[PDB]
Amino acid sequence: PRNTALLKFVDAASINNCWNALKKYSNLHAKHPNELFEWTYTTPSFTTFVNFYKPLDIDYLKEDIHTHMAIFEQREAQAQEDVQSSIVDEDGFTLVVGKNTKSLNSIRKKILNK
Amino acid sequence: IEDISAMKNGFIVVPFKLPDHKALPASLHFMFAKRHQSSNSNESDCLFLVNLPL
Amino acid sequence: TSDDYVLRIFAIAFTRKQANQVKRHSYAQSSHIRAIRKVISEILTKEVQGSTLAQLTSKLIPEVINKEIENATKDIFPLQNIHVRKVKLLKQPKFDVGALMALHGEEKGKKVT
Amino acid sequence: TATESYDIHIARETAELFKSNIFKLQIDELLEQVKLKQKHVLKVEKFLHKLYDILQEIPDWEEKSLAEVDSFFKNKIVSVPFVDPKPIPQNTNYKFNYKKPDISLIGSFALKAGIYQPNGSSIDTLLTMPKELFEKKDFLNFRCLHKRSVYLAYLTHHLLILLKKDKLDSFLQLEYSYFDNDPLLPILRISCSKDYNFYKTRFSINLLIGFPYKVFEPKKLLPNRNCIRILPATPLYNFSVLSSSTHENYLKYLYKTKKQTESFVEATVLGRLWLQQRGFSSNMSHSGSLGGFGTFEFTILMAALLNGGGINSNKILLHGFSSYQLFKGVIKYLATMDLCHDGHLQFHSNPASKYIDEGFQTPTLFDKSTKVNILTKMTVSSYQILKEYAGETLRMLNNVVQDQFSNIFLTNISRFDNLKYDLCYDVQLPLGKYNNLETSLAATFGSMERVKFITLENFLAHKITNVARYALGDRIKYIQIEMVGQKSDFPITKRKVYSNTGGNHFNFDFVRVKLIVNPSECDKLVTKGPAHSETMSTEAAVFKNFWGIKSSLRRFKDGSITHCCVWSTSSSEPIISSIVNFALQKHVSKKAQISNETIKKFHNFLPLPNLPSSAKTSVLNLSSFFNLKKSFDDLYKIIFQMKLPLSVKSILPVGSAFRYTSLCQPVPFAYSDPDFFQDVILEFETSPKWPDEITSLEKAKTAFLLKIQEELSANSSTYRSFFSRDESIPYNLEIVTLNILTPEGYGFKFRVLTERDEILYLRAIANARNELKPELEATFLKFTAKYLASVRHTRTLENISHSYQFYSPVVRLFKRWLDTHLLLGHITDELAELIAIKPFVDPAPYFIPGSLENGFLKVLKFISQWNWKDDPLILDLVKPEERLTLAQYKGIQMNFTNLRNSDPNGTHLQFFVASKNDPSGILYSSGIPLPIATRLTALAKVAVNLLQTHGLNQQTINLLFTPGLKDYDFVVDLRTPIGLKSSCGILSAPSNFPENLNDLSEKMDPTYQLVKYLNLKYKNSLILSSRKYIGVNGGEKGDKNVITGLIKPLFKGAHKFRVNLDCNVKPVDDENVILNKEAIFHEIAAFGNDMVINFETD
């Protein structure tokens, strides 16, 4: 869906009222094109350009690296313990456990490669 | 030329008059809109918008 | 080398014992020593052909190639002392004042009468 | 012995198996496309038969006085060509005769070798003058030359009578000319206008006047014996009269040659095509021209080499050899054997040839039949460039990798003077009158001078070569003089060649002093001379009276006391130009004017930084580069002895200033340069606990750089650093770069490469879907093109640049070539630089480029004549004599087979530039439109065609250098509110870094990111271009930026409405939708609201 957008509404009455206003706008363009609105951009200026060429916020980057490393190590511990915590099947079959495997996703995708 | 306001597929025409330029011999921007149907939970009562401006 | 020098490098290494060991010697067998010599020869030729002679000298300054050999042959055998013993030249390229001077980082006198 | 000799011969043949195939194919091919028609042969032979009837029905006459001859020739219309000095009755006691002539034909058309030529060829016709007409003392004091002149003039007049009798004046025109540009020997040229008019066969028949076999003594005719009295001799005149005596045994023994060998005709045409493509012909080179070597001298050398040539009378060229084998034999002999300073050759053409190893400062080929010396007309510089070009042909044939037959036999290098040679100087000399010469000349032209250098053209040419070579010395390798304005054709009514151009009554307009320059010693400020002793030596005395006021006595840094002459280095004009101006001003004439305006304006177009002493800073100077190297070494020190939890490994720069490719010379604290922040990689030691997720991997990189910045600001607080983002590779948004500012005023951006990036990228390209495979392939292609291959390119190109210092200005200027032409932003920098380096590293068939203009003209010429669709660019990026072999050659060629089966029309790939540091060759040329690549090639084609049509001049060079501003649809002229020339570093100065990073970003210009974001939001429908170097391309103050626009025809056309179009739309009816031009224009206007000024549309 390139060059498109998605406008979510609150309820059916809202989306129905907006669709009625849009078909009335189409009829207004059909009958009298002068009453139509004007589109105004929030015009980017040198403040916006120095915002784009502006350095990053050090505390924002610091809290970002902290929280993402925390959740990432949580994920990595959970995956390795789950895969090498001796997963057994329902009818008495045992999953093969190996030296430093932390990834059942890599078990299945390495079977997919081979 | 001024009566193109509705497509046979079900799309509508939204023209907008732009602010003029100091050295250009108003101009119209064309946007399209249609309701979008889906069984997704977070995609309830949505407007599929086509040709978004900058 | 990449700057056309011909070089010969001698590297030496030592086995070590683990702390848990109670055996008073930690020898390596024949497959061990042959694989060890192979992989260090690999990293030697690969790195000297990935670098020039100038960057090679500044690479042998910190002895980070030996740390690389440890963290590469870590999966074979425990080692304590890994060293390059010798570096000998064989054939020198043709001298460039440009290369030597651009490494090193046009003169006028005093009018004798 | 014999058996091992057959073994080494079959070893030669086994090594020469495939080249035999390809070369027999090529030679039979080009000989098909060059060969004549037997129809042309028969037309012209019946023509010469009718002329033979005329020459046998011309009658004869006896002794008459010179005054009666003058009365006859003032009574009739034809003028006799008396060569200076004119004969006088006081020193001419004798009279004249004319009897039957001995008629023969000469030239390769008599050697049975006729070929088609665009301009025309020569079928020379020899008319031999009788021994009874010869007196027993005629070789002395120009008397035989007067007999030859009166013979020729009476023959022309009676031929004119017989021609107007035989009605042929409607088709047969007569003129006078010079055989091989010798001023003393005039011949006739009979041609036809438009049954015996042979215009389609395009010939022009020469009629000569010759002498018979063994008519004068070789003992008194040798070059060391005089012939003119008033003791020096006249070797050129002696050789002329002797070879005009023995053309005839030459052709009989060379018909003996043609009867002993078979493919001689084709081999001689190979030699003739070699000469006519490299630029040599048979004309005189002593008169300020180039030549002296045609098919005549060629076939004499050919017979001499079949006769032998070696030290011990051995055989080098066998009669059982082919055209190719004759060509390669003569070229190896001419490449390995010296004839001017080392030795000379000898042969009895009537025992077996022998080399004798004493030199006579003259090319010396000896036949003891009538004691001839064949190569006396070629000058020392002409034989020098001949043996260099022979070594070049030896290199071209020794290349067993490339197919260089095109570069040997398709390139007339004398199409462009400024592309064949390196340096050109325009010299205008208003001499005046031969009696005014004593005050208008600095040298002496007297009786002995006239005897040794019979033509004043020869004398001035030799003296200017002498003064220029003794002034320059080792600062050039080769020295040549072209003389513009020379004509060798004069009508029958004038006594000699007459003109009034060049400020005098002589036949030249001006002088082109042309130089093949030694690149390593070209910019030495000092000219070292002799040592210093108690008595003034001869070389010290000639140094003193050669230099005068510039001469001095100096001591060195070791204290060394020698004679030396220093100069002042200038950026706009070179030291070679200054010293040649000084020499040609003092030792030739005080009124001649010397200029090198093309090199002057090139060096003026090169930008200049705002550093002290930049005006007298040379072009090859590397001071700012050395200072940034020292600053980077200090930063290397600090961040190397930094302690990190993981032991650090590698800190390698990849910067353009380190690769000597920066546009603006890097000025300290110049924070408006796009090349201010140069990239340096930082590699760690290997470790097992790497994150196996790419986002957390780049976040681990940011944590590395975060503690790097923290420790840096904690220990070395003078250093200021910050963080900036890198979005050059898509879909990896967390590549955050560490920018560091040194107190010296330099910037470096740090990016970490490790073992897991390409592994996780391979995991992604294995996991992705087939429809998404080419996009991720392009991203990985750009990734490994920016990261590791750039490092390999940087190190090897740093080696090659320190070998070739003269690559650094042209690869800086080449960006300036296409920065002004809107086509750097679409193309990759490594691709552009390899196009810049190719003619330097492969100088076939040029000279090795030792000048900016020559190299850049070579570059643009190769882009223009690049048939990119067909032949791949294979480069061997090595220092001059790791090299690429035949297996890698065929592998790249089979990659090219996959290339032309994957994309024929250029719709996926255009330029296949490949070298050692890329097995791909496709790794760099993506991210480009085919209209843009074809537009680069066609713009180079326009440049070469304008070079071909309108010479070289300031207006054509400015038209090459200015943008066209045409073949785009819409153009937006923008402005920045503050000038940027001082902050970017060009002098027509910022003190230190400000206390505000937002103020740094305020000084930084957003035009590049604006244009790139517009290209990103409109990639499918638009192809935009602009300038990135505003401080150099923004006028006199540097605040101008121009955004042009191209629309694809795919969206110029009308297409149906879709939901995945990615463009601004407007409908025409219920189904058809086109683009909204005015909406796009108002969109970019609202984006650049405070910056837009001018806007035009077609």
Coordinates of N, CA and C in Angstrom, one line a residue, chain D residues 926-1054:
Chain D
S926 N 24.7 0.3 -9.7 CA 23.2 0.3 -9.5 C 22.9 1.5 -8.6
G927 N 21.6 1.9 -8.7 CA 21.1 3.2 -8.2 C 21.2 4.3 -9.2
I928 N 20.9 4.0 -10.4 CA 21.2 4.8 -11.6 C 20.1 4.7 -12.6
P929 N 19.6 5.7 -13.3 CA 18.8 5.6 -14.5 C 19.6 5.4 -15.7
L930 N 19.1 4.5 -16.6 CA 19.7 4.4 -17.9 C 19.7 5.6 -18.8
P931 N 18.6 6.5 -18.7 CA 18.8 7.8 -19.4 C 20.0 8.6 -18.8
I932 N 20.2 8.5 -17.5 CA 21.3 9.2 -16.9 C 22.7 8.7 -17.4
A933 N 22.8 7.3 -17.4 CA 24.1 6.7 -17.8 C 24.4 7.0 -19.3
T934 N 23.4 6.8 -20.2 CA 23.5 7.2 -21.6 C 23.7 8.7 -21.8
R935 N 23.2 9.5 -20.9 CA 23.4 11.0 -21.0 C 24.8 11.3 -20.6
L936 N 25.4 10.6 -19.6 CA 26.9 10.8 -19.4 C 27.7 10.4 -20.6
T937 N 27.4 9.3 -21.2 CA 28.2 8.9 -22.4 C 28.0 9.9 -23.5
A938 N 26.8 10.3 -23.8 CA 26.5 11.2 -24.9 C 27.1 12.6 -24.7
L939 N 27.1 13.0 -23.4 CA 27.7 14.3 -23.1 C 29.2 14.2 -23.4
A940 N 29.9 13.1 -23.0 CA 31.3 12.9 -23.4 C 31.4 12.9 -24.9
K941 N 30.5 12.3 -25.6 CA 30.5 12.3 -27.1 C 30.5 13.7 -27.7
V942 N 29.6 14.5 -27.1 CA 29.5 15.9 -27.5 C 30.8 16.6 -27.3
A943 N 31.4 16.3 -26.1 CA 32.7 17.0 -25.8 C 33.8 16.6 -26.8
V944 N 33.9 15.3 -27.1 CA 34.9 14.8 -28.1 C 34.6 15.4 -29.5
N945 N 33.4 15.4 -29.9 CA 33.1 15.9 -31.2 C 33.3 17.4 -31.4
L946 N 33.1 18.1 -30.3 CA 33.4 19.6 -30.3 C 34.9 19.8 -30.3
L947 N 35.6 18.9 -29.6 CA 37.1 18.9 -29.7 C 37.6 18.6 -31.1
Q948 N 36.9 17.7 -31.8 CA 37.3 17.3 -33.2 C 37.0 18.4 -34.1
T949 N 35.9 19.1 -34.0 CA 35.4 20.1 -34.9 C 36.0 21.5 -34.7
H950 N 36.3 21.9 -33.4 CA 36.7 23.3 -33.1 C 38.0 23.4 -32.3
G951 N 39.0 22.5 -32.6 CA 40.3 22.6 -32.0 C 40.4 22.5 -30.5
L952 N 41.2 23.4 -29.9 CA 41.2 23.7 -28.5 C 41.3 25.2 -28.3
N953 N 40.5 25.7 -27.4 CA 40.4 27.2 -27.2 C 39.6 27.4 -25.9
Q954 N 39.6 28.6 -25.4 CA 39.0 29.0 -24.2 C 37.4 28.8 -24.3
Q955 N 36.9 29.2 -25.4 CA 35.4 29.1 -25.5 C 34.9 27.7 -25.6
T956 N 35.6 26.8 -26.3 CA 35.2 25.4 -26.4 C 35.4 24.8 -25.0
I957 N 36.5 25.1 -24.3 CA 36.7 24.5 -23.0 C 35.6 25.0 -22.0
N958 N 35.2 26.3 -22.1 CA 34.2 26.8 -21.2 C 32.8 26.1 -21.6
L959 N 32.6 25.8 -22.9 CA 31.4 25.1 -23.2 C 31.4 23.6 -22.8
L960 N 32.6 23.0 -22.7 CA 32.7 21.7 -22.1 C 32.4 21.8 -20.6
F961 N 32.8 22.8 -20.0 CA 32.8 22.9 -18.5 C 31.5 23.5 -18.0
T962 N 30.7 24.3 -18.7 CA 29.5 24.8 -18.2 C 28.4 23.7 -18.3
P963 N 27.4 23.8 -17.4 CA 26.2 22.9 -17.7 C 25.5 23.3 -18.9
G964 N 24.8 22.3 -19.5 CA 24.0 22.6 -20.7 C 22.7 23.4 -20.4
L965 N 22.1 23.0 -19.2 CA 20.8 23.5 -18.7 C 19.7 23.2 -19.7
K966 N 19.9 22.2 -20.6 CA 18.9 21.8 -21.6 C 18.7 20.3 -21.6
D967 N 17.6 19.9 -22.2 CA 17.1 18.5 -22.2 C 16.6 18.1 -20.8
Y968 N 16.2 19.1 -20.0 CA 15.4 18.8 -18.8 C 14.1 19.5 -19.0
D969 N 13.1 19.2 -18.1 CA 11.8 19.7 -18.3 C 11.6 21.0 -17.4
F970 N 11.9 20.9 -16.2 CA 11.7 22.0 -15.2 C 13.0 22.3 -14.4
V971 N 13.2 23.6 -14.1 CA 14.4 24.0 -13.4 C 14.0 25.0 -12.3
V972 N 14.5 24.7 -11.1 CA 14.2 25.5 -9.9 C 15.5 26.1 -9.5
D973 N 15.7 27.4 -9.6 CA 16.8 28.2 -9.1 C 16.6 28.7 -7.6
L974 N 17.4 28.2 -6.7 CA 17.2 28.3 -5.3 C 18.3 29.3 -4.8
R975 N 18.2 29.7 -3.5 CA 19.2 30.5 -2.8 C 19.3 30.1 -1.4
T976 N 20.5 30.3 -0.8 CA 20.7 30.2 0.6 C 21.0 31.6 1.2
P977 N 20.4 31.9 2.4 CA 20.5 33.3 2.9 C 21.9 33.8 3.3
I978 N 22.9 32.9 3.4 CA 24.2 33.3 3.8 C 25.2 32.7 2.8
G979 N 26.3 33.4 2.5 CA 27.3 32.9 1.6 C 28.2 31.9 2.3
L980 N 28.7 30.9 1.6 CA 29.4 29.8 2.1 C 30.8 29.6 1.6
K981 N 31.4 30.6 0.9 CA 32.7 30.3 0.3 C 33.8 30.3 1.3
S982 N 33.8 31.1 2.3 CA 34.8 31.2 3.3 C 34.7 30.0 4.3
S983 N 33.4 29.6 4.6 CA 33.2 28.5 5.5 C 33.5 27.2 4.8
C984 N 33.3 27.1 3.5 CA 33.6 25.8 2.8 C 35.1 25.8 2.4
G985 N 35.8 26.9 2.4 CA 37.2 26.9 2.2 C 37.7 27.2 0.8
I986 N 37.2 28.3 0.1 CA 37.7 28.7 -1.2 C 38.0 30.2 -1.1
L987 N 39.3 30.6 -1.5 CA 39.7 32.0 -1.4 C 39.3 32.7 -2.7
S988 N 38.8 33.9 -2.6 CA 38.4 34.7 -3.8 C 39.5 35.8 -4.0
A989 N 37.5 33.7 6.7 CA 38.0 32.5 7.3 C 37.4 32.3 8.7
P990 N 36.8 31.1 8.9 CA 36.3 30.8 10.3 C 37.4 30.6 11.2
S991 N 37.3 31.2 12.4 CA 38.4 31.1 13.4 C 38.4 29.7 14.1
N992 N 37.3 29.4 14.8 CA 37.2 28.1 15.5 C 35.7 27.7 15.5
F993 N 35.5 26.5 16.1 CA 34.2 25.9 16.2 C 33.3 26.7 17.1
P994 N 32.0 26.9 16.8 CA 31.1 27.6 17.7 C 30.7 26.7 18.9
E995 N 30.1 27.4 19.9 CA 29.7 26.7 21.1 C 28.3 26.1 21.0
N996 N 27.8 26.0 19.8 CA 26.4 25.5 19.6 C 26.4 24.6 18.4
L997 N 26.0 23.3 18.6 CA 25.8 22.3 17.5 C 24.7 22.6 16.6
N998 N 23.6 23.3 17.2 CA 22.5 23.8 16.3 C 23.0 24.9 15.4
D999 N 24.0 25.7 15.9 CA 24.6 26.7 15.0 C 25.5 26.1 13.9
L1000 N 26.1 24.9 14.3 CA 26.9 24.2 13.3 C 25.9 23.6 12.2
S1001 N 24.8 23.1 12.6 CA 23.8 22.6 11.7 C 23.2 23.8 10.9
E1002 N 23.1 25.0 11.5 CA 22.6 26.2 10.8 C 23.6 26.6 9.7
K1003 N 24.9 26.5 9.9 CA 25.9 26.7 8.9 C 25.8 25.6 7.8
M1004 N 25.6 24.3 8.2 CA 25.5 23.2 7.3 C 24.3 23.4 6.4
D1005 N 24.4 23.0 5.1 CA 23.4 23.3 4.1 C 22.6 22.1 3.8
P1006 N 21.2 22.2 3.7 CA 20.3 21.1 3.6 C 19.9 20.8 2.2
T1007 N 20.6 21.3 1.2 CA 20.2 21.1 -0.2 C 20.4 19.7 -0.7
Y1008 N 21.4 19.0 -0.3 CA 21.7 17.6 -0.7 C 20.6 16.7 -0.1
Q1009 N 20.3 16.8 1.2 CA 19.3 16.0 1.8 C 17.9 16.3 1.2
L1010 N 17.7 17.6 0.9 CA 16.4 18.0 0.2 C 16.2 17.3 -1.1
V1011 N 17.2 17.4 -2.0 CA 17.2 16.8 -3.3 C 17.1 15.3 -3.2
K1012 N 17.8 14.7 -2.3 CA 17.8 13.2 -2.1 C 16.4 12.7 -1.6
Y1013 N 15.8 13.5 -0.6 CA 14.5 13.2 -0.2 C 13.4 13.3 -1.3
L1014 N 13.6 14.3 -2.1 CA 12.7 14.5 -3.3 C 12.9 13.3 -4.3
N1015 N 14.1 12.9 -4.5 CA 14.3 11.7 -5.3 C 13.8 10.4 -4.7
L1016 N 13.8 10.3 -3.4 CA 13.2 9.2 -2.7 C 11.7 9.2 -2.8
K1017 N 11.1 10.3 -2.6 CA 9.6 10.3 -2.6 C 9.1 10.3 -4.0
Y1018 N 9.9 10.6 -5.0 CA 9.5 10.5 -6.4 C 10.5 9.6 -7.3
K1019 N 11.0 8.5 -6.8 CA 11.9 7.7 -7.5 C 11.3 7.0 -8.8
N1020 N 10.0 6.6 -8.7 CA 9.4 5.9 -9.8 C 9.1 6.8 -11.0
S1021 N 8.8 8.1 -10.7 CA 8.3 9.0 -11.7 C 9.2 10.1 -12.1
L1022 N 10.3 10.3 -11.3 CA 11.1 11.5 -11.4 C 12.6 11.1 -11.2
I1023 N 13.5 11.9 -11.9 CA 14.9 11.7 -11.8 C 15.5 13.1 -11.7
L1024 N 15.9 13.5 -10.5 CA 16.2 14.9 -10.2 C 17.8 15.0 -10.0
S1025 N 18.3 16.2 -10.3 CA 19.7 16.4 -10.1 C 19.9 17.9 -9.6
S1026 N 21.1 18.1 -8.9 CA 21.4 19.3 -8.3 C 22.9 19.4 -8.1
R1027 N 23.3 20.4 -7.4 CA 24.7 20.6 -7.0 C 24.9 20.3 -5.5
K1028 N 26.0 19.7 -5.1 CA 26.3 19.5 -3.7 C 27.4 20.4 -3.2
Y1029 N 28.3 20.9 -4.1 CA 29.3 21.8 -3.7 C 28.9 23.2 -4.1
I1030 N 28.1 23.8 -3.2 CA 27.6 25.2 -3.4 C 28.7 26.2 -3.3
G1031 N 29.7 26.0 -2.5 CA 30.7 27.0 -2.3 C 31.6 27.2 -3.5
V1032 N 31.6 26.2 -4.4 CA 32.4 26.3 -5.6 C 31.5 26.5 -6.8
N1033 N 30.2 26.0 -6.7 CA 29.3 26.1 -7.9 C 28.1 27.1 -7.6
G1034 N 28.4 28.1 -6.7 CA 27.4 29.1 -6.4 C 27.7 30.5 -6.8
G1035 N 28.6 30.7 -7.8 CA 28.9 32.0 -8.3 C 30.1 32.6 -7.5
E1036 N 30.2 33.9 -7.5 CA 31.3 34.6 -6.9 C 31.2 34.6 -5.4
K1037 N 30.0 34.4 -4.8 CA 29.8 34.4 -3.4 C 29.4 33.1 -2.8
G1038 N 28.9 32.2 -3.6 CA 28.7 30.8 -3.2 C 27.4 30.6 -2.4
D1039 N 26.2 31.0 -3.0 CA 25.0 30.7 -2.4 C 23.9 30.2 -3.3
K1040 N 24.3 29.6 -4.5 CA 23.4 29.3 -5.5 C 23.3 27.8 -5.7
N1041 N 22.1 27.3 -5.9 CA 21.8 25.9 -6.1 C 20.7 25.8 -7.0
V1042 N 20.8 24.9 -8.0 CA 19.8 24.7 -9.1 C 19.3 23.3 -9.1
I1043 N 18.0 23.2 -9.1 CA 17.3 21.9 -9.1 C 16.6 21.7 -10.4
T1044 N 17.1 20.9 -11.3 CA 16.5 20.6 -12.6 C 15.7 19.4 -12.5
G1045 N 14.9 19.1 -13.6 CA 14.0 17.9 -13.5 C 13.8 17.2 -14.8
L1046 N 13.7 15.9 -14.8 CA 13.4 15.0 -15.9 C 12.2 14.2 -15.6
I1047 N 11.3 14.0 -16.6 CA 10.2 13.1 -16.4 C 10.4 11.9 -17.4
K1048 N 10.2 10.7 -16.8 CA 10.2 9.5 -17.6 C 9.0 9.5 -18.7
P1049 N 9.2 9.0 -19.9 CA 8.1 8.9 -20.8 C 7.0 8.0 -20.4
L1050 N 7.3 7.0 -19.5 CA 6.4 6.1 -19.0 C 5.2 6.8 -18.3
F1051 N 5.6 7.8 -17.6 CA 4.6 8.6 -16.9 C 4.3 10.0 -17.6
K1052 N 5.0 10.3 -18.6 CA 4.5 11.3 -19.5 C 3.3 10.8 -20.3
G1053 N 3.3 9.5 -20.6 CA 2.2 8.9 -21.2 C 1.0 8.8 -20.3
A1054 N -0.1 8.3 -20.8 CA -1.4 8.2 -20.1 C -1.6 6.7 -19.7

